[PDB]
Amino acid sequence: VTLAKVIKVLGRTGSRGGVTQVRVEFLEDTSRTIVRNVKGPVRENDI
Amino acid sequence: IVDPRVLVTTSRDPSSRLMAFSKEIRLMFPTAIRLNRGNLILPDLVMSAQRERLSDIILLHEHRGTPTAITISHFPHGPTLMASLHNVVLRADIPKSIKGTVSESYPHLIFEGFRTPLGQRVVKILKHLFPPRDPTNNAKSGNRVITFVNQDDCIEVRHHVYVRTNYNSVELSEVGPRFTMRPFSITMGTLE
Amino acid sequence: FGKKKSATAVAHVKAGKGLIKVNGSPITLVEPEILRFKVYEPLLLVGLDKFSNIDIRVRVTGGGHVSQVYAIRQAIAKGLVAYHQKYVDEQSKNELKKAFTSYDRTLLIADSRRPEPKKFGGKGARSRFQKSYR
Amino acid sequence: PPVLTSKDKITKRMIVVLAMASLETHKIDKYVLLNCDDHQGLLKKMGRDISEARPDITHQCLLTLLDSPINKAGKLQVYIQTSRGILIEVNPTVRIPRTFKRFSGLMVQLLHKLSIRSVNSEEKLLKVIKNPITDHLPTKCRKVTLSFDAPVIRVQDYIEKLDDDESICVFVGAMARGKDNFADEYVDEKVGLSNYPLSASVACSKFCHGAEDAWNIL
Amino acid sequence: PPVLTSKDKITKRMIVVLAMASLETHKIYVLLNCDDHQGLLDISEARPDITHQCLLTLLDSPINKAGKLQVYIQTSRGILIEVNPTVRIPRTFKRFSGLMVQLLHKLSIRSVNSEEKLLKVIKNPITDHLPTKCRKVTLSFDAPVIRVQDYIEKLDDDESICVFVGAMARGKDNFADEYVDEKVGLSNYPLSASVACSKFCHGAEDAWNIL
Amino acid sequence: EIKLFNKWSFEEVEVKDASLVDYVQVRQPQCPIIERLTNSLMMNGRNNGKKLKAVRIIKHTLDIINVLTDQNPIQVVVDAITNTGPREDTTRVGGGGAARRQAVDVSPLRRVNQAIALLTIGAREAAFRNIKTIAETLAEELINAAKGSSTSYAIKKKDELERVAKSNR
RNA sequence: AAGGGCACCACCAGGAGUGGAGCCUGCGGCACGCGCGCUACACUGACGGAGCCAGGAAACUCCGUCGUGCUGACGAGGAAUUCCUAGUAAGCGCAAGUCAUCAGCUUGCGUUGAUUACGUCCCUGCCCUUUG
């Protein structure tokens, strides 16, 4: 579900940005939401 | 009609060994369903037949009186028959290399010892049970045959894969399962 | 009036006083307790509109324990709302009802579950015996 | 001094797993352990098990660990892990047999019966258990693989960094040679202990020493 | 790493001497030892495994690899052996015994090529072979416990350190009393001979920034 | 089916970091709200093969696990499975032979679940304190997961799973 | 070979599990091997009194005694491998077949009463084409 883009919010006005997700080597579907690290599309996700 | 679907139902006295026989005889190739619970008390068989849309059913039961008993049942009038079988612990297992095996192909049938007998029921049963899809077109590429032979009072169920050469030539290789059925109680349909 | 997964509880309805006896006892007791509430929680559950009322009570009996408990359950509020007008509420008996079932599952009708079915197999049902021919 | 076992999932402790241990019975009509002295003839004939028959290493390591203060202090348990995939738990109070001949006898018996029982007590001394090792391990446990080609560490320092409620599990290859990946699937990292190649036993003393220093054991 | 020998009497090394070593050949020759000669017999005077154990424990050490260690063996019958730091002692007791038996008969094990002597029987006492600045100590359960690292750091920049350990299963710590300056303990628990060896090696490796 | 209430009824409607709360009393993505967790804590307890007493278990484990340094009991139970889930472990590879295993989420309901039957487990595996209080091990361990929510002290593998899915990534 | 599908007799996610143990009953052998099981390693327990009720059932609830000590073979099982996605699994039990007596079987039947999934990825099977 490789986290899509990271469209945060201004500067210091965002506890954390959101992030869509699906999958490549498994699933595939729309999404966003729960996670607040700071990786990137370089990083990825799972389904 | 559509292909008849089969429902395998483990009875209250079904065990591991009998369940192994169920699994090998039945398989999702693909007109079959398995349940780990079932009973032959009743109207219950008619209930399961309607709710699961299965016109073929096999109950698995074992007591010392009737060990490894497989009660074949058809929704159509003229049904039930108990077929009990037993295996020897010394039988070697054929685990599959000979049979790369395409699941869902129309099996061939050979019956040795056809008559006349009130039996005829058994031939009718197994032909209705495993002949799957009824087509007008047949591709000649194999694969397997279901053989049933009468052995001076027991029916010998065997399954072979076909091999063909230019020597003729058909040769057979057994893939199992190998079953000797002992005939038990029978129920037959009314004329209506 | 309400049976539960092989069990069955009967409903008594005609206005009276306190002490609503289940079986022939008192929804004080009802001793297959632990979760002895969820019984006193239909009456308690009356927490939504009423406080206890002033009516009746009947006996249950079928299958086994927690079965029965869950039965007497509907049994009650499936009999507060009793038609009415002599039992439920002489008007708009959705008073309780929709309230006594905006967090219910007992008076909230019964569950489509019920024991049966096995298999020519092992235990039966679906759990077909464990075999491993060699 | 409470005896440590896998059942206990909380205590902070040091665990050594002798991975890739060479234990195998041998038929002849009597049983013995497959070993490079007796069976170098046979092994070669059959064109293999070249040094896959070094049960002595395991034997050495065991003496070395159990004889250690950290064991005497009850802050250490050991596990074995066979070439053939057999996992053993070793009761820390077991006075393992001093000689290899007597060791062999007992390992042959352990392998056939899956446990070794005290004649008076009902706790086992050795017990074959189910993989993976990671079920039996403490819940908060750091896991590492000893390796010559890994970054060298001072064990005393490596240990003082552990959360006060966090154990340490070390996998040693109880063998003469081989890739140090016998545990890649479980460990957090690999570490070296010396700029010199060590023997399994020595790696084991070195590590015990280190824990003994850091955990204040004399 | 230039090899340490009894001739070099200056260099600062650590020396371990395995005392009361059980190395008694038995005519049939092989090494006399519990396993085989249990029946034939007192088992305590026949524990060569302990020696074999310690030799592995000692020669495998980082400190020997750094060549600041020296092993000597002095049996329970007063035979004295200098071990060459670079000898790769047999790993199995059986092979060990073959070799150990031969050495006792021939008085030395020679390398199949080099002039060096992998193992040698030397004449007593052990004092005539140690370095001239050398502290003599005996290990003993019955003595004041110490931190090996601390102890080693108190040594003169020239002073070597020679510990006498008993390669035995049981017994009096007296075996080196005529030579020792001091007897000390490394633990609150009683240790096996080989474990006592690790302790010292490791503590001194630490003291000496090895490695 | 089939628990109770009262006994404290301290309903902390906050404490729910990350996602979670959007499933703190749920199941779906696959139940619904299988009573605010504590219906699964009490349920993951049926590891012999039958609830009730299990029900007791829970309850006792509760009155206990709150009596002892109260954090509103329920919020200790939430704040139990709260700061106590996995977070992007690995899972096979296939890209090799002879795999390797890469990591990632952690489908929430996971994080809750995979820590639920887990804390449940660590409990079950008494052996410390091998007392006689199932609900104690069940508590303390869950309490050593509230107070333990201060390291380590019972979960542990909690970390492991995560403090590992970093290197072999 | 290719390309693609379906399935808990196939994997994944887990659940319970046998394989270790004692006895059980089969298939061999003719001291011993392989299989289906029964009950156990115990504190969610055993043990006595008590509460109830199913298609004086038992598991089970309460009150009290034992003190995690082979107590009131076997210390949870190697390599393998079984089965199952909900009135299931799992546990607990009874009716019936068996019958003069005999159930560790079996077909059933109620009693308590989970955890699991986006599933398809790969190992096994099957299939459908094509391709020889």
PDB file of C-alpha atoms in Angstrom, chain E residues 3-181:
ATOM      1  CA  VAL E   3      56.729 -16.272  19.333  1.00  0.00           C
ATOM      2  CA  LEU E   4      57.231 -16.313  23.116  1.00  0.00           C
ATOM      3  CA  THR E   5      59.657 -18.841  24.630  1.00  0.00           C
ATOM      4  CA  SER E   6      61.410 -19.496  27.921  1.00  0.00           C
ATOM      5  CA  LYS E   7      64.584 -17.937  26.462  1.00  0.00           C
ATOM      6  CA  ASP E   8      62.928 -14.540  26.106  1.00  0.00           C
ATOM      7  CA  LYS E   9      63.181 -13.476  29.753  1.00  0.00           C
ATOM      8  CA  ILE E  10      62.421  -9.774  29.223  1.00  0.00           C
ATOM      9  CA  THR E  11      59.083  -9.414  27.366  1.00  0.00           C
ATOM     10  CA  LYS E  12      55.968  -8.842  29.495  1.00  0.00           C
ATOM     11  CA  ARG E  13      53.737 -11.875  29.046  1.00  0.00           C
ATOM     12  CA  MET E  14      51.070 -13.823  30.850  1.00  0.00           C
ATOM     13  CA  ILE E  15      51.916 -17.394  31.706  1.00  0.00           C
ATOM     14  CA  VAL E  16      49.548 -20.113  32.744  1.00  0.00           C
ATOM     15  CA  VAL E  17      50.928 -23.319  34.156  1.00  0.00           C
ATOM     16  CA  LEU E  18      48.534 -26.264  34.305  1.00  0.00           C
ATOM     17  CA  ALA E  19      49.536 -28.038  37.507  1.00  0.00           C
ATOM     18  CA  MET E  20      48.787 -31.559  38.715  1.00  0.00           C
ATOM     19  CA  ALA E  21      48.037 -32.354  35.090  1.00  0.00           C
ATOM     20  CA  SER E  22      47.005 -35.984  34.644  1.00  0.00           C
ATOM     21  CA  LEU E  23      49.324 -37.235  31.890  1.00  0.00           C
ATOM     22  CA  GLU E  24      50.218 -40.788  32.723  1.00  0.00           C
ATOM     23  CA  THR E  25      50.565 -43.219  29.841  1.00  0.00           C
ATOM     24  CA  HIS E  26      49.227 -46.733  30.323  1.00  0.00           C
ATOM     25  CA  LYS E  27      50.901 -49.768  28.752  1.00  0.00           C
ATOM     26  CA  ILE E  28      48.658 -51.943  26.570  1.00  0.00           C
ATOM     27  CA  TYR E  29      50.556 -47.080  24.937  1.00  0.00           C
ATOM     28  CA  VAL E  30      47.664 -44.650  25.432  1.00  0.00           C
ATOM     29  CA  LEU E  31      46.765 -41.938  28.000  1.00  0.00           C
ATOM     30  CA  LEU E  32      45.430 -43.166  31.312  1.00  0.00           C
ATOM     31  CA  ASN E  33      41.962 -41.728  31.766  1.00  0.00           C
ATOM     32  CA  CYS E  34      38.671 -42.212  33.614  1.00  0.00           C
ATOM     33  CA  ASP E  35      36.560 -43.417  30.643  1.00  0.00           C
ATOM     34  CA  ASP E  36      38.605 -46.447  29.653  1.00  0.00           C
ATOM     35  CA  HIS E  37      40.473 -47.111  32.861  1.00  0.00           C
ATOM     36  CA  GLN E  38      37.634 -46.495  35.275  1.00  0.00           C
ATOM     37  CA  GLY E  39      37.404 -50.219  35.891  1.00  0.00           C
ATOM     38  CA  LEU E  40      41.140 -50.907  35.909  1.00  0.00           C
ATOM     39  CA  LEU E  41      41.279 -48.812  39.117  1.00  0.00           C
ATOM     40  CA  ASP E  42      41.360 -43.693  42.187  1.00  0.00           C
ATOM     41  CA  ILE E  43      39.801 -41.719  39.302  1.00  0.00           C
ATOM     42  CA  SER E  44      41.065 -38.271  40.364  1.00  0.00           C
ATOM     43  CA  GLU E  45      44.703 -38.854  39.301  1.00  0.00           C
ATOM     44  CA  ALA E  46      43.377 -39.688  35.800  1.00  0.00           C
ATOM     45  CA  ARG E  47      41.640 -36.609  34.360  1.00  0.00           C
ATOM     46  CA  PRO E  48      43.734 -35.631  31.305  1.00  0.00           C
ATOM     47  CA  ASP E  49      40.545 -34.292  29.680  1.00  0.00           C
ATOM     48  CA  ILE E  50      40.827 -31.325  32.027  1.00  0.00           C
ATOM     49  CA  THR E  51      44.256 -30.504  30.630  1.00  0.00           C
ATOM     50  CA  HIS E  52      43.023 -31.008  27.072  1.00  0.00           C
ATOM     51  CA  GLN E  53      40.050 -28.800  27.874  1.00  0.00           C
ATOM     52  CA  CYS E  54      42.252 -25.978  29.190  1.00  0.00           C
ATOM     53  CA  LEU E  55      44.713 -26.169  26.278  1.00  0.00           C
ATOM     54  CA  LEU E  56      41.893 -25.452  23.863  1.00  0.00           C
ATOM     55  CA  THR E  57      40.509 -22.778  26.187  1.00  0.00           C
ATOM     56  CA  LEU E  58      43.992 -21.221  26.406  1.00  0.00           C
ATOM     57  CA  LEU E  59      45.443 -21.478  22.903  1.00  0.00           C
ATOM     58  CA  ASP E  60      42.173 -20.357  21.358  1.00  0.00           C
ATOM     59  CA  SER E  61      42.279 -17.138  23.328  1.00  0.00           C
ATOM     60  CA  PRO E  62      42.659 -13.681  21.733  1.00  0.00           C
ATOM     61  CA  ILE E  63      45.661 -13.180  24.064  1.00  0.00           C
ATOM     62  CA  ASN E  64      47.554 -16.133  22.612  1.00  0.00           C
ATOM     63  CA  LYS E  65      46.638 -14.980  19.122  1.00  0.00           C
ATOM     64  CA  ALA E  66      48.187 -11.662  20.145  1.00  0.00           C
ATOM     65  CA  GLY E  67      51.079 -13.730  21.443  1.00  0.00           C
ATOM     66  CA  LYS E  68      51.271 -12.368  24.981  1.00  0.00           C
ATOM     67  CA  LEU E  69      50.410 -15.773  26.466  1.00  0.00           C
ATOM     68  CA  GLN E  70      52.537 -18.776  27.384  1.00  0.00           C
ATOM     69  CA  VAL E  71      51.370 -22.171  28.574  1.00  0.00           C
ATOM     70  CA  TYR E  72      53.265 -24.659  30.712  1.00  0.00           C
ATOM     71  CA  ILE E  73      52.033 -27.995  31.985  1.00  0.00           C
ATOM     72  CA  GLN E  74      53.380 -29.601  35.166  1.00  0.00           C
ATOM     73  CA  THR E  75      51.915 -33.044  35.810  1.00  0.00           C
ATOM     74  CA  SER E  76      51.049 -34.734  39.096  1.00  0.00           C
ATOM     75  CA  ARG E  77      54.309 -36.675  38.777  1.00  0.00           C
ATOM     76  CA  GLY E  78      56.473 -33.628  38.256  1.00  0.00           C
ATOM     77  CA  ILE E  79      57.047 -33.821  34.509  1.00  0.00           C
ATOM     78  CA  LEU E  80      57.380 -30.343  32.947  1.00  0.00           C
ATOM     79  CA  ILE E  81      56.193 -29.314  29.476  1.00  0.00           C
ATOM     80  CA  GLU E  82      56.585 -26.060  27.568  1.00  0.00           C
ATOM     81  CA  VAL E  83      53.812 -25.480  25.067  1.00  0.00           C
ATOM     82  CA  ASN E  84      54.567 -23.465  21.949  1.00  0.00           C
ATOM     83  CA  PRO E  85      52.006 -20.610  21.593  1.00  0.00           C
ATOM     84  CA  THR E  86      51.538 -21.317  17.862  1.00  0.00           C
ATOM     85  CA  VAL E  87      50.750 -25.043  18.175  1.00  0.00           C
ATOM     86  CA  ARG E  88      47.248 -25.930  16.927  1.00  0.00           C
ATOM     87  CA  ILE E  89      46.487 -28.561  19.567  1.00  0.00           C
ATOM     88  CA  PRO E  90      44.303 -31.465  18.373  1.00  0.00           C
ATOM     89  CA  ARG E  91      40.615 -30.666  18.855  1.00  0.00           C
ATOM     90  CA  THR E  92      39.573 -34.160  19.936  1.00  0.00           C
ATOM     91  CA  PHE E  93      40.711 -35.872  23.087  1.00  0.00           C
ATOM     92  CA  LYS E  94      41.472 -39.046  21.140  1.00  0.00           C
ATOM     93  CA  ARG E  95      43.870 -37.292  18.761  1.00  0.00           C
ATOM     94  CA  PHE E  96      45.117 -35.302  21.731  1.00  0.00           C
ATOM     95  CA  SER E  97      46.082 -38.555  23.478  1.00  0.00           C
ATOM     96  CA  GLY E  98      47.888 -40.054  20.522  1.00  0.00           C
ATOM     97  CA  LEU E  99      49.992 -36.929  20.472  1.00  0.00           C
ATOM     98  CA  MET E 100      50.343 -36.587  24.231  1.00  0.00           C
ATOM     99  CA  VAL E 101      51.520 -40.224  24.517  1.00  0.00           C
ATOM    100  CA  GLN E 102      54.106 -39.764  21.774  1.00  0.00           C
ATOM    101  CA  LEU E 103      55.468 -36.557  23.378  1.00  0.00           C
ATOM    102  CA  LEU E 104      56.029 -38.289  26.723  1.00  0.00           C
ATOM    103  CA  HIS E 105      57.972 -41.090  25.004  1.00  0.00           C
ATOM    104  CA  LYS E 106      60.006 -38.809  22.718  1.00  0.00           C
ATOM    105  CA  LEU E 107      60.300 -35.738  25.038  1.00  0.00           C
ATOM    106  CA  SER E 108      59.299 -33.287  22.303  1.00  0.00           C
ATOM    107  CA  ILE E 109      56.973 -32.881  19.322  1.00  0.00           C
ATOM    108  CA  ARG E 110      58.704 -31.465  16.280  1.00  0.00           C
ATOM    109  CA  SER E 111      57.052 -29.664  13.381  1.00  0.00           C
ATOM    110  CA  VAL E 112      57.284 -31.812  10.234  1.00  0.00           C
ATOM    111  CA  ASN E 113      59.345 -28.971   8.691  1.00  0.00           C
ATOM    112  CA  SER E 114      60.338 -26.092  10.997  1.00  0.00           C
ATOM    113  CA  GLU E 115      63.144 -26.393  13.550  1.00  0.00           C
ATOM    114  CA  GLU E 116      60.726 -25.169  16.227  1.00  0.00           C
ATOM    115  CA  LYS E 117      59.411 -27.620  18.819  1.00  0.00           C
ATOM    116  CA  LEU E 118      55.632 -27.547  19.097  1.00  0.00           C
ATOM    117  CA  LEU E 119      55.831 -29.195  22.536  1.00  0.00           C
ATOM    118  CA  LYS E 120      58.804 -29.955  24.774  1.00  0.00           C
ATOM    119  CA  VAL E 121      59.584 -31.639  28.078  1.00  0.00           C
ATOM    120  CA  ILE E 122      61.856 -29.246  29.990  1.00  0.00           C
ATOM    121  CA  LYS E 123      63.725 -29.746  33.274  1.00  0.00           C
ATOM    122  CA  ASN E 124      62.526 -28.451  36.654  1.00  0.00           C
ATOM    123  CA  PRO E 125      62.006 -26.186  38.229  1.00  0.00           C
ATOM    124  CA  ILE E 126      59.635 -23.906  36.380  1.00  0.00           C
ATOM    125  CA  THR E 127      61.382 -20.920  37.962  1.00  0.00           C
ATOM    126  CA  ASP E 128      64.422 -21.339  35.695  1.00  0.00           C
ATOM    127  CA  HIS E 129      62.245 -20.738  32.635  1.00  0.00           C
ATOM    128  CA  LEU E 130      60.039 -17.818  33.649  1.00  0.00           C
ATOM    129  CA  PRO E 131      60.895 -14.124  32.986  1.00  0.00           C
ATOM    130  CA  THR E 132      63.058 -12.373  35.577  1.00  0.00           C
ATOM    131  CA  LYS E 133      60.395  -9.807  36.442  1.00  0.00           C
ATOM    132  CA  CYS E 134      57.424 -12.136  37.029  1.00  0.00           C
ATOM    133  CA  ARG E 135      54.671 -12.255  39.674  1.00  0.00           C
ATOM    134  CA  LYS E 136      53.904 -15.795  40.813  1.00  0.00           C
ATOM    135  CA  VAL E 137      50.306 -16.460  41.814  1.00  0.00           C
ATOM    136  CA  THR E 138      48.125 -19.479  42.626  1.00  0.00           C
ATOM    137  CA  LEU E 139      44.421 -19.713  41.920  1.00  0.00           C
ATOM    138  CA  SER E 140      42.334 -20.963  44.830  1.00  0.00           C
ATOM    139  CA  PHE E 141      38.696 -21.073  45.867  1.00  0.00           C
ATOM    140  CA  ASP E 142      40.075 -20.674  49.392  1.00  0.00           C
ATOM    141  CA  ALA E 143      41.451 -17.164  48.866  1.00  0.00           C
ATOM    142  CA  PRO E 144      40.531 -13.450  48.545  1.00  0.00           C
ATOM    143  CA  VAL E 145      38.494 -12.891  45.373  1.00  0.00           C
ATOM    144  CA  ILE E 146      39.796 -10.297  42.882  1.00  0.00           C
ATOM    145  CA  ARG E 147      38.978  -8.461  39.678  1.00  0.00           C
ATOM    146  CA  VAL E 148      41.480  -9.785  37.157  1.00  0.00           C
ATOM    147  CA  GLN E 149      41.417  -6.485  35.264  1.00  0.00           C
ATOM    148  CA  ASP E 150      42.329  -4.471  38.401  1.00  0.00           C
ATOM    149  CA  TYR E 151      45.087  -6.891  39.449  1.00  0.00           C
ATOM    150  CA  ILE E 152      46.793  -6.841  35.994  1.00  0.00           C
ATOM    151  CA  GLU E 153      46.906  -3.004  35.951  1.00  0.00           C
ATOM    152  CA  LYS E 154      48.995  -2.897  39.143  1.00  0.00           C
ATOM    153  CA  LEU E 155      51.876  -4.675  37.423  1.00  0.00           C
ATOM    154  CA  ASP E 156      55.158  -2.969  36.605  1.00  0.00           C
ATOM    155  CA  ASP E 157      55.478  -2.075  32.921  1.00  0.00           C
ATOM    156  CA  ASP E 158      58.031  -4.909  32.800  1.00  0.00           C
ATOM    157  CA  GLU E 159      56.482  -7.376  35.260  1.00  0.00           C
ATOM    158  CA  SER E 160      55.021 -10.528  33.698  1.00  0.00           C
ATOM    159  CA  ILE E 161      52.298 -12.523  35.378  1.00  0.00           C
ATOM    160  CA  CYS E 162      52.329 -16.293  35.921  1.00  0.00           C
ATOM    161  CA  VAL E 163      49.316 -18.109  37.347  1.00  0.00           C
ATOM    162  CA  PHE E 164      49.255 -21.670  38.636  1.00  0.00           C
ATOM    163  CA  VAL E 165      45.959 -23.446  38.029  1.00  0.00           C
ATOM    164  CA  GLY E 166      45.120 -27.013  38.999  1.00  0.00           C
ATOM    165  CA  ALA E 167      44.122 -29.228  36.046  1.00  0.00           C
ATOM    166  CA  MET E 168      42.410 -31.554  38.503  1.00  0.00           C
ATOM    167  CA  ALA E 169      38.871 -32.330  39.651  1.00  0.00           C
ATOM    168  CA  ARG E 170      39.440 -31.811  43.376  1.00  0.00           C
ATOM    169  CA  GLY E 171      42.115 -31.019  45.942  1.00  0.00           C
ATOM    170  CA  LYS E 172      44.578 -28.873  47.878  1.00  0.00           C
ATOM    171  CA  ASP E 173      45.818 -25.593  46.390  1.00  0.00           C
ATOM    172  CA  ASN E 174      49.275 -26.373  47.751  1.00  0.00           C
ATOM    173  CA  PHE E 175      50.700 -27.660  44.418  1.00  0.00           C
ATOM    174  CA  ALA E 176      52.694 -24.477  43.736  1.00  0.00           C
ATOM    175  CA  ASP E 177      53.239 -23.122  47.280  1.00  0.00           C
ATOM    176  CA  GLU E 178      57.048 -23.336  47.091  1.00  0.00           C
ATOM    177  CA  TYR E 179      56.943 -20.897  44.151  1.00  0.00           C
ATOM    178  CA  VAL E 180      53.943 -18.601  44.690  1.00  0.00           C
ATOM    179  CA  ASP E 181      53.972 -15.048  46.110  1.00  0.00           C
TER     180      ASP E 181
END
